[PDB]
């Protein structure tokens, strides 16, 4: 759907520039131009568009979950899941940025991945460190913004630290 | 008032079991065994119980910030605010679970006013000026592992204090790796 993707692209451009709290359904309707008439055919609420942006950008995450269903429950699998999850959240970097600025977007807003990381019967220390490594990559986009440096250089250094934590669970 | 604390305990248990928005004043009064009029005498609305639950628990955080502006910018200092920030969230783990499972509870308390400006303040004392990107990332990783820790620590099965010590220990290892 080219029109439905164009509604998301215009709204995402305004959420980055103007903010999710400030962007109105009228503003995005004006930026859509002629495609304004297709807006209310796909969505009816601004929250409905933000969820659709999260659904589209969460594409590589859904493939990662389905791929991990067919992997052995080993430490190497957890590490490959953690590396691919870091690359999957790449496209959601602007989405994390509007959450830290808009309180309602954070309220509007991984368990399947945790189920694959979870080791049944493992020690509480090992299980906490597995969740620590997963949370370090997940919430990483929130605090990496304040750090000065190349976004890719910071993402890889965080993934390096998370993997060390993941290895400490064994 | 001892009755006032008993309402908050019964409310917190119901908040966790079925949800803050799902539960009602009717279910909180019936759970304690008092009348509706007796419940409203202590709290005018369900929101006032949630405010009282989250009350006083954030005091040690402000004391941690004022204490941090007093210490030298050394690795032992960063290690100590990590251990003290973990203690400050000891009792706030069930509250953070409520804010996750209820947008109305999150909006009522407010994520920005409850430990967001202070996390930015703790990170400023945490920030090592002129350090490498690898060191700066690992310092922020250790701080974020304990901050966001109280969110996902309720999902892992185990003693709440035993899980906090294991997470704090892991974050300390990450902070040490920044050197």
Summary of the model, kept short:
The first copy, chain A, contains twelve helices and no strands. By secondary structure, chain A is mainly α.
Oligomer class: homodimer
Total number of helices of chain A: 12
Strand content of chain A: under 5%
The CATH topology of chain A: Tetracycline Repressor, domain 2
PDB class: transcription
Keywords: Transcription factor, transcription
Assembly: dimeric
Entry title: Crystal Structure of a transcription factor
Q: What do these coordinates show?
A:
The structure is a homodimer. With 170 residues, chain A is mostly helical. Chain A has a single domain, classed as Tetracycline Repressor, domain 2 (Orthogonal Bundle), CATH 1.10.357. Chain A is 73% helix and 0% strand. Chain A contains twelve helices and no strands. Chain A has helices spanning 2-17, 25-31, 36-42, 46-57, 59-68, 75-88, 93-101, 103-108, 111-117, 124-138, 140-143, 151-167. In chain A, helix 6 (75-88) packs antiparallel against helix 12. The longest helix of chain A has 17 residues, at 151-167. Chain A binds chain B through residues 103, 106-108, 114, 124-125, 127-129, 131-132, 135-136, 139-140, 142-144, 146-150, 153-154, 157-158, 160-162, 164-165, 168, and chain B through 103, 106-107, 110-112, 120, 123, 127, 133-134, 136-138, 140-141, 143-145, 148-149, 151-153, 155-159, 162-163, 166-167, 169-171, 173-174, 177. Chain A: It comes from Streptomyces griseoluteus. Chain A: GO terms for molecular function: DNA-binding transcription factor activity; transcription cis-regulatory region binding. Chain A: This is TetR/AcrR family transcriptional regulator. Chain A: InterPro entries: DNA-bd_HTH_TetR-type_CS, Homeodomain-like_sf, HTH-type_TetR-like_transc_reg, HTH_TetR. Chain A: Keywords: DNA-binding, Transcription, Transcription regulation.
